[PDB]
Amino acid sequence: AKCDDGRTTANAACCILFPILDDIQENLFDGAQCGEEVHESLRLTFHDAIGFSPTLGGGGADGSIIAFSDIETNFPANAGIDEIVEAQKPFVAKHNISAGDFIQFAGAVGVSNCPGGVRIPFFLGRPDAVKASPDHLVPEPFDSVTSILARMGDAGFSPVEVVWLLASHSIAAADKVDPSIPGTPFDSTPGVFDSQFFIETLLKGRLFPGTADNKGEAKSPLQGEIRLQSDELLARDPRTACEWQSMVNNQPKIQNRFAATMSKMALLGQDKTKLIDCSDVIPTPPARVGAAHLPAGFSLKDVEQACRKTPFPRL
Ligand code: HEM
Ligand SMILES: [Ca+2]
Ligand SMILES: [Ca+2]
């Protein structure tokens, strides 16, 4: 199909997305930055989608977190999500697009702003949400690996897919884990979609960036970085450690697996064959990304060698 843009897109329905793209790049993502709103919008994709269980219910990637915001944003596991929910509502209202579609579109567009980022497939056509998600479907940072793998598994994800999806924490920060230091990132490069998150979570902890004893928080290797207990544990657990290590310095794998698994996540509760492929609207991300490295001052002795099959690579 040809849009009024002049642009050719695979399916005519997708032409509606171009005005949406322009508006959100300016007015949601603050001049097309890989900044706070991108990070928040990416988190929203997960908090919407993961509300899906074959037995426990939930409609998955259905916009429920927006449509039923008073219910869902008050779930303890959704702490801090209301800000982005309320920021997205005026865009949904004016752009003739379901909340579920908008959440996934915004997430994909936002990731595309990040150097090193990847294009996530995007499908148009999710109906309006039917029902609120049940509570207790969103993993929390104080949950055990067993719990997280069971919940993610219930939703449809294998342990390696959980690791792949956590590449998201390469462009991510926390506001509520330690409320004394809002905006503290999970890696040294929160504006770059890269492997630093996988490296830095394997360093041996030295300090807390704010206060000690916050629920769900682990010791960090670096001032200005916060570490989740869940990420600390996933990096080290026999079920996930070797996959975690396999990401370090494998940018192409991080990109490829994140895109594929995000697409799967974006389609929970949905049927791709009933939706319209509009992937070609998502921009190409900036390609420049540097080599993976240990932070300044650190050496191999500072790396926890959790994977037993393979040593941590020379960077
Ligand atoms: C697997 C279990 C996971 C746990 C326990 C977890 C936990 C967390 C926590 C505690 C925060 C900080 C919230 C705050 O205090 O402000 C966070 C942020 C974030 N999460 Fe995860 N997460 C998980 C998986 C995911 C997945 C699968 C995605 C994929 C989209 C994701 C994307 C993000 C992003 C992008 C942020 C940063 C938000 C921002 O900076 O505004 N998370 N996550
Ligand atoms: Ca949902
Ligand atoms: Ca990063």
Numbering used by the authors: 1 to 315
Sentences from the paper on this structure:
Versatile peroxidase (VP, EC 1.11.1.16) constitutes the third family of ligninolytic peroxidases, which was described 20-years ago. VP combines catalytic properties of the above two families due to the presence of both a Mn-oxidation site and a catalytic tryptophan in its molecular structure. In the present work, VP (isoenzyme VPL2) from Pleurotus eryngii has been subjected to protein engineering using a rational design strategy.
A high number of basic residues with their side chains exposed to the solvent, most of them with no movement restrictions by interactions with surrounding amino acids, were identified in MnP4 (31 of a total of 34 present in the protein, including 20 lysines and 11 arginines). Seven of these exposed residues (4 lysines and 3 arginines) were introduced into VPi, and the VPi-br variant containing the 8 mutations present in VPi plus mutations T2K/A131K/Q219K/L288R/A308R/A309R/A314R was obtained. The analysis of the VPi-br crystal structure also revealed that the seven solvent-exposed basic residues introduced in this variant present a configuration similar to that observed for the homologous residues in MnP4. Their side-chains appear interacting with water molecules through hydrogen bonds or do not present any interaction, and no contacts are observed with surrounding residues. VPi-br and VPi-ss crystal structures exhibited minor differences compared with VPi regarding the interactions involving the mutated residues in region A (VPi-br also regarding the interactions of residues in region C), and no significant changes were identified in the other regions described. In our case, the increased stability of VPi-br at acidic pH compared with VPi could be explained by a general stabilizing effect of the extra basic residues participating in charge-charge interactions with other charged amino acids of the protein surface (although these interactions were not observed in the VPi-br crystal structure) and by interacting with the solvent improving the solubility of the protein. It should be also noted that the polar surface of the VPi-br variant is significantly increased with respect to VPi by replacing five hydrophobic residues (four alanines and leucine) with polar charged amino acids (four arginines and one lysine). Unlike what observed at low pH, VPi-ss only exhibited a slight increased stability after 1 h incubation at pH 7 compared with VPi. Both VPi-br and VPi-ss not only did not show an additional improvement at longer times at neutral pH but, on the contrary, VPi-br significantly reversed the improvement attained in VPi.
